[PDB]
Design a protein around this ligand. Structure first.
Ligand SMILES: CCCCCCCCCCCCCCCCCC(=O)OC[C@H](COP(=O)([O-])OCC(O)COP(=O)([O-])OC[C@@H](COC(=O)CCCCCCCCCCCCCCCCC)OC(=O)CCCCCCCCCCCCCCCCC)OC(=O)CCCCCCCCCCCCCCCCC
Ligand SMILES: CCCCCCCCCCCCCCCCCC(=O)OC[C@H](COP(=O)([O-])OCC(O)COP(=O)([O-])OC[C@@H](COC(=O)CCCCCCCCCCCCCCCCC)OC(=O)CCCCCCCCCCCCCCCCC)OC(=O)CCCCCCCCCCCCCCCCC
Ligand SMILES: CCCCCCCCCCCCCCCCCC(=O)OC[C@H](COP(=O)(O)OCCN)OC(=O)CCCCCCCCCCCCCCCCC
Ligand SMILES: CCCCCCCCCCCCCCCCCC(=O)OC[C@H](COP(=O)(O)OCCN)OC(=O)CCCCCCCCCCCCCCCCC
Ligand SMILES: CCCCCCCCCCCCCCCCCC(=O)OC[C@H](COP(=O)(O)OCCN)OC(=O)CCCCCCCCCCCCCCCCC
Ligand SMILES: CCCCCCCCCCCCCCCCCC(=O)OC[C@H](COP(=O)(O)OCCN)OC(=O)CCCCCCCCCCCCCCCCC
Ligand SMILES: CCCCCCCCCCCCCCCCCC(=O)OC[C@H](COP(=O)(O)OCCN)OC(=O)CCCCCCCCCCCCCCCCC
Ligand SMILES: CCCCCCCCCCCCCCCCCC(=O)OC[C@H](COP(=O)(O)OCCN)OC(=O)CCCCCCCCCCCCCCCCC
Ligand code: HEC
Ligand code: HEM
Ligand code: HEM
Lengths: 244, 60, 31, 388, 65, 70, 116
């Protein structure tokens, strides 16, 4: 049973952003964000990703402004003292499907759909885990009976998860002309979530490559400097008047 | 040998000139390394950058 | 004294170059 | 030499102390690259202090804003991700180089006379480092931070007479809550400066008696000044450490971390695997291995008792382990046992890890319980191998 | 589109993990025969699916666009 | 903290009259011979316990997994 | 017990290894006794003849120089080395015996270690 408690390990997929000089597939990011805002935004919330984060990554500023203007947001008290509602702006954050955690639990039968902002860093082996969990909605083995209201997922720690399979084949219509298969949606959503959890990957990797190279050159020079300074001592001949 | 001695007599007779040379070389080397790493980045991951998605401006 | 003046001017040039490299006001420099 | 007029600005009183104790302090001319780690722990401390100050310009010690403030540093602040990764991986680097420092001391028996005070101040520095790193790790207010703080501070109620009273006083209430977070933040800010003071006293004692050397022999015959001969050596060390640190910042920034810390703390739910950072793991492993948790706290105290009692052992005139084959093998066994015990800490408390940790702790204490015997027996070597 | 790359490749690499599947089927036989208390053998299931997933992982992204 | 003079005679050479980085890779095979010959006991003592414990743990884990796997 | 290399194979191997190491660095076993360590070794060295102490300092300087240069004594002098030919143990024993007597009946320590 300890095997079931731990959960089935997830493999190592060759992600397009995995390497030392590979970047996010921004088309995949855009598609994954579309999938999130269409199917996943009904239950899970990001609440750490502002709309302004999308410009220059997946969308243009006009597109982001239109998308923000699509939704409504409550605003601070007006001159009359009432809490009114206005269309969203570029600087607002992603909306929350539920007012509070207790509301989310009541809606979802006691299960709290976790915030997806850092889901690829919160879970061990986050990217592979999320992709496998989304796509690995298989049939339970012989003898195991999941309590009613739950769905079996081998990669979920415990065996049974509260969400059903949401990445149903043919659930979204991509705006670019990509067939929406379950694996396609899984890869796109994981790319989007991994960007949302680490928007600094490209700049971070560029800085790392440059500074590793430059500091290796510095290390070579420092070794030469040390060998030059110590060359006087390490090649001296001293006569000591003693033998044994 | 001759080239190193020639550049030595050019730029290593006053420490102020040497400091100016060090700063200028640091700046130029930094910019050159930036350019080279950026070219390697472009060569490696082609078809993924922001200004490459086919539908970048059609969400209106 | 003339040699001291030349050395001081060269050191001022070096310090100005260092400050310019640190701040990078290439955008600011209109004239 | 009458100082009627100025010769050297280094020898003027304004720069005389620095001249002596940095530029002109004589050191043995055969020191290896294992002393650069002592030179490098100070650099790690400075990096931690600077990055911590610039982080504290952005962190909010409240219980409803700590996690969001850390994410604010991650995302909104320009270069903030660099600051946070530098602080975290720099705590890791600080502990790595300090462990290398300690183990070189153990190998070359630097704790032996006359550097008992150096070793004891080092042990006090180790206490300060551990407390600082822990109370700082509680700051981001993740699941691991909250529950590690709960477990470790609650395991201070093992003291017989007071116990619950000290725990309640430390928590500022009845559970790890906002008061404990604010208190931990203030203490985390303060303690590194005491750590700087302790490092300065450490260096003052060492400079009182001078540094050891690989042979372990008296070395006032062949000595050279610190600058420039060891400055360049330490420079090579610093640049290599910079390459290591840059790898650990820009390519594997979370490998040394634990993913459950990226979940906002939830006192009504417990993570399945509550474990401290990798550099508290051996201590945690000893504590868990000894049952009867009061006994575990007693064992943790006994570890520091042994560390402080190391320099006050028997004769053992030969100190360097290059001339001590038995002590050399014992040291390698100790290092292997410490690495294994650190591995055990991350493992669950199920079988066979309980037995593996119970044997490992016994070996760890046997190391300290065997060295005086080695010294006593080896006190009579020359009379036995003499060629008369 | 009714096609699915992941399921397709799982079916494709099904014959490359015959031994764990055989063991799992034998265990299904045993569990059906017993059918007494609460016995189950998720272990064979885990081994078989883990090996299959280890197989499918690279080809899936190679064939995914 | 005094100096102890020894009555030596020391000949030294300018650092600019002698090559610097060649001695690193000069006589390399004998260097590797020394590094391996005088230290294999130490490497055995450092790594042997670790690999042995890992092998024991994996054996025990697999045996328990088979036994408990029904 | 008293285990010597004549009556113990393990002691024979231990002595062989120590001889090999000391011969490599060309310094006697007594040279490893630090005067700063005990302060009884300091007195014993203060009582020894100047020729002997100067030879000790020369051997130690040679060993430290070899350690810095990352090399060993050439095989000629390595075969000419005589470790375990002691020069200090008798004097150290005399000093410790005198200190023990003085401590045993009345007496103040003739020398003491500073703190620290
Ligand atoms: C291999 C060939 C090494 C050749 C060489 O340098 O020999 C000289 C060197 C001389 O030895 P020595 O006399 O002790 O000299 C030490 C002095 O302190 C040396 O004095 P120094 O202060 O001049 O030191 C100079 C330093 C200067 O070093 C350099 O100049 C090298 C710097 C190069 C750039 C480094 C960039 C690092 C980038 C890392 C990226 C990591 C990515 C990881 C990704 C992971 C992904 C999962 O070089 C060394 O210390 C020698 C090389 C050390 C590294 C090996 O000999 C060796 O290094 C021997 C190597 C083999 C040892 C035995 C191995 C047995 C293995 C059994 C299994
Ligand atoms: C089976 C048999 C296998 C036998 C393998 C023997 C072997 O690998 O011996 C190498 C070598 C022993 O050769 P050795 O020349 O007889 O002893 C070295 C001398 O004691 C000291 O002589 P040294 O100063 O030449 O060696 C010190 C060592 C120092 O090496 C380290 O600090 C590396 C420690 C890695 C752990 O540095 C090097 O070997 C040259 C490269 C130095 C670059 C600067 C590194 C500064 C720290 C960098 C940042 C670290 C954070 O092993 C070690 O030094 C310890 C390795 C790590 C143990 C943990
Ligand atoms: C902003 C500040 C941030 C923090 C800065 C570092 C704080 C360090 C705190 C501890 C300082 C303790 C004093 C160190 C300096 C000292 O002791 O100098 C002694 C010297 C006395 O003069 P003199 O008798 O000539 O001594 C030299 C030869 N015996 O003293 C003098 O002559 C004057 C020395 C002035 C300071 C020099 C540095
Ligand atoms: C006297 C000194 C002062 C007193 C205080 C004590 C000081 C101790 C100084 C040394 C400190 C060493 C700290 C070691 C930390 C080890 C961390 C660890 O356990 O990492 C395990 C991890 C394996 O991967 P992971 O998937 O996380 O493991 C399964 C967990 N469910 O990652 C690894 O295994 C990576 C490698 C870890 C280090 C080597 C372990 C080798 C032995 C294990 C196999 C046997
Ligand atoms: C585990 C402990 C095994 C040895 C027990 C006896 C003992 O403690 O002997 C002490 C002595 C240590 O020798 P060591 O200090 O390593 O090197 C010589 C430089 N003093 O070791 C010896 O003298 C060992 C001689 C006998 C051989 C082992 C029995
Ligand atoms: C392409 C190869 C270019 C090689 C240039 C140097 C040629 C040379 O002579 O290399 C050998 C030299 C070590 O020579 P040495 O130890 O003095 O003895 C041999 C004497 N012939 O080797 C060296 O000096 C190599 C070590 C020093 C390298 C320093 C590199 C610094 C680069 C900084 C770039 C900054 C960019 C920003
Ligand atoms: C019980 C242990 C009894 C040891 C008795 C004395 C052994 C002395 C000796 O020579 O041991 C062999 C060896 C060190 O000697 P050596 O071969 O010279 O090593 C350097 C060159 N290989 O290896 C050793 O000395 C290793 C000793 C390990 C002791 C572990 C005790 C637990
Ligand atoms: C961790 C939990 C807390 C409780 C810990 C309790 C202690 C556990 C370990 C006990 C170890 C032994 C303690 C007793 C001291 C040593 C006894 C001894 O032998 O001292 C003698 C020695 C040499 O003196 P000698 O020359 O023999 O005297 C002449 C007399 N005829 O004397 C010397 O060489 C003098 C040495 C001077 C330095 C001593 C340092 C002791 C440790 C201090 C740590 C704190 C330092 C202060 C800063 C931090 C404060 C918090
Ligand atoms: C977009 C397709 C979605 C992604 C990606 C994820 N979900 Fe869900 N989800 C829902 C509930 C009620 C839960 C809680 C179950 C539990 O904690 O047992 C979850 C959980 C997750 C998790 C957590 C996995 C883990 O804890 O290891 C992940 C990574 C996740 N979900 C991703 C509910 C819903 C839901 C309402 C019906 C929708 C539309 C989604 N989830 C969509 C996504
Ligand atoms: C005065 C100096 C210091 C200040 C002002 C400081 C301040 C802070 C602040 C504000 C945080 C929370 C921000 C964050 O979590 O990234 C933090 C975290 C931390 N600090 Fe410090 N710190 C200082 C020195 C140190 C030192 C010396 C150590 C190591 C011994 C240390 C270890 C840590 C650790 C481990 C964390 C947790 C990092 C994490 O997991 O996010 N700090 N510190
Ligand atoms: C804040 C962390 C520490 C710093 C900054 C530090 C700093 C230093 C410095 C600068 C030296 C002199 C250079 C050298 O010998 O390597 C030194 C030596 C020494 N340190 Fe530390 N140290 C630290 C932690 C420790 C610890 C934890 C111990 C052990 C408990 C310790 C024990 C020693 C010993 C024994 C020496 C003497 C080295 C010799 O044999 O010559 N140090 N330390």
């Amino acid at each position: 049973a300890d095997e079931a408690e731990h959960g089935l390990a997830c493999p190592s997929y060759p992600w397009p952003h995995k390497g030392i000089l590979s970047s996010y597939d921004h088309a995949s990011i855009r598609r994954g964000h579309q999938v999130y805002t269409e199917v996943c935004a009904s239950c899970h919330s990001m609440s750490l990703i502002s709309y302004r984060d999308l410009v220059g990554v997946a969308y243009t500023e006009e597109e982001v402004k239109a998308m923000a203007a699509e939704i409504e947001v409550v605003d601070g008290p007006n001159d009359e003292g009432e809490m009114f509602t206005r269309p969203g702006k570029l600087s607002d954050r992603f909306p929350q499907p539920y007012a509070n955690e207790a509301a989310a639990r009541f809606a979802n039968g006691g299960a709290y759909p976790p915030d997806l902002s850092l889901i690829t860093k919160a879970r061990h082996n986050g990217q592979n885990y999320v992709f496998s969990l989304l796509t690995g909605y298989r049939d339970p083995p012989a003898g195991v009976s999941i309590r009613e209201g739950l769905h079996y997922n081998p990669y979920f720690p415990g065996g049974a998860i509260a969400m059903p399979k949401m990445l149903n084949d043919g659930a979204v219509e991509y705006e670019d002309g990509t067939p929406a298969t379950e694996a396609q949606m899984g890869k796109d959503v994981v790319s989007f979530l991994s960007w949302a959890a680490e928007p600094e990957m490209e700049e971070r990797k560029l800085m790392g490559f440059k500074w590793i190279f430059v500091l290796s050159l510095a290390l070579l020079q420092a070794a030469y400097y040390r060998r030059l300074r110590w060359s006087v001592l390490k090649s001296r001949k001293l006569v000591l008047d003693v033998v044994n | 040998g001759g080239i190193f001695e020639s550049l030595y007599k050019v730029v290593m007779r006053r420490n102020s000139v040497y400091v100016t040379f060090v700063i200028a070389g640091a700046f130029l080397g930094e910019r050159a390394v930036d350019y080279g790493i950026h070219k390697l980045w472009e060569a490696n991951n082609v078809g993924k950058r922001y200004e490459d998605i086919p539908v970048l401006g059609q969400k209106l | 004294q003339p040699a001291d003046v030349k050395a001081a001017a060269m050191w001022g040039v070096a310090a100005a170059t260092g400050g310019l490299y640190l701040v990078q006001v290439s955008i600011l420099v209109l004239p | 030499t009458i100082r009627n007029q100025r010769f050297s600005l280094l020898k003027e009183p304004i720069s005389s102390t620095l001249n002596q104790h940095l530029i002109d302090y004589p050191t043995p001319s055969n020191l290896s690259y294992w002393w650069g780690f002592g030179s490098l722990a100070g650099i790690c401390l400075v990096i931690q202090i600077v990055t911590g100050v610039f982080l504290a310009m952005h962190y909010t010690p409240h219980v409803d804003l700590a996690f969001n403030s850390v994410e604010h540093v991650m995302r909104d602040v320009e270069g903030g991700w660099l600051l946070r990764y530098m602080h975290a991986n720099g705590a890791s680097m600080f502990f790595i180089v300090v462990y290398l420092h300690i183990f070189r001391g153990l190998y070359y028996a630097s704790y032996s006379s006359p550097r008992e005070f150096v070793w004891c101040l080092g042990v006090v520095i180790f206490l300060l480092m551990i407390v600082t790193a822990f109370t700082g790790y509680v700051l981001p207010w993740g699941q691991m931070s909250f529950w590690g703080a709960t477990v470790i501070t609650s395991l201070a109620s093992a003291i017989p007479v007071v116990g619950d009273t000290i725990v309640t006083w430390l928590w500022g209430g009845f559970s790890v809550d906002n008061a404990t977070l604010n208190r931990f933040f203030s203490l985390h800010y303060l303690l590194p400066f005491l750590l700087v003071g302790a490092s300065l006293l450490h260096l003052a004692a060492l400079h009182q008696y001078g540094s050891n050397n690989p042979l372990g022999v008296h070395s006032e015959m062949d000595q050279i000044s610190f600058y420039p001969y060891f400055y360049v050596k330490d420079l090579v060390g610093w640049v290599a450490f910079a390459i290591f640190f840059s790898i650990w910042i820009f390519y594997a920034p979370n490998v040394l971390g634990h993913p459950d810390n990226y979940i906002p703390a939830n006192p009504m739910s417990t993570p399945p695997h509550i474990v401290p950072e990798w550099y508290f793991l051996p201590i945690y492993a000893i504590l868990r291995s000894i049952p009867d948790k009061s006994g575990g706290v007693a064992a943790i105290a006994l570890v520091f008792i042994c560390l402080l009692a190391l320099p006050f052992f028997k004769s053992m005139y030969v100190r360097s382990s290059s001339f001590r084959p038995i002590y050399q093998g014992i040291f390698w066994l100790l290092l292997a046992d410490c690495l294994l015990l650190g591995w055990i800490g991350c493992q669950p408390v199920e079988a066979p890890f309980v037995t593996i940790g119970q044997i490992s702790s016994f070996v760890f204490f046997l190391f300290f319980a065997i060295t005086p015997i080695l010294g006593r027996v080896g006190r009579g070597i020359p009379n036995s191998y003499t060629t008369d | 589109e009714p096609v699915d790359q992941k399921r397709y490749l799982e079916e494709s690499c099904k014959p490359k993990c015959v031994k764990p599947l055989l063991e799992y089927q034998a265990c299904i036989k045993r569990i059906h025969g017993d059918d007494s208390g609460q016995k189950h053998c998720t272990g064979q299931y885990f081994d078989y699916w883990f090996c299959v997933d280890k197989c499918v992982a690279p080809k899936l992204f190679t064939k995914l666009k | 903290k005094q100096i102890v003079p020894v009555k030596s005679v020391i000949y030294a050479l300018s650092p600019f009259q002698q090559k610097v980085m060649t001695g690193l890779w000069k006589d390399l095979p004998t260097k590797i011979h020394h590094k391996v010959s005088e230290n294999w006991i130490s490497a055995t003592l450092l790594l042997g316990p670790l690999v042995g414990t890992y092998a024991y743990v994996q054996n025990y884990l697999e045996k328990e997994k088979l036994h408990h796997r029904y | 017990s008293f285990l010597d290399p004549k009556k113990n194979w393990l002691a024979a191997q231990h002595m062989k290894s120590l001889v090999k190491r000391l011969s490599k660095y060309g310094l006697r076993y007594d040279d490893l006794y630090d005067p700063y360590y005990d302060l009884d070794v300091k007195e014993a060295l203060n009582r020894l003849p100047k020729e002997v102490v100067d030879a000790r300092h020369a051997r130690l300087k040679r060993a430290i120089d070899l350690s810095m240069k990352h090399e060993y004594l050439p095989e000629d002098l390595q075969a000419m080395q005589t470790p375990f030919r002691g020069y200090l143990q008798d004097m150290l024993a005399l000093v410790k015996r005198e200190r023990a007597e003085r401590e045993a009946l009345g007496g103040l320590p003739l020398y003491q270690r500073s703190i620290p």
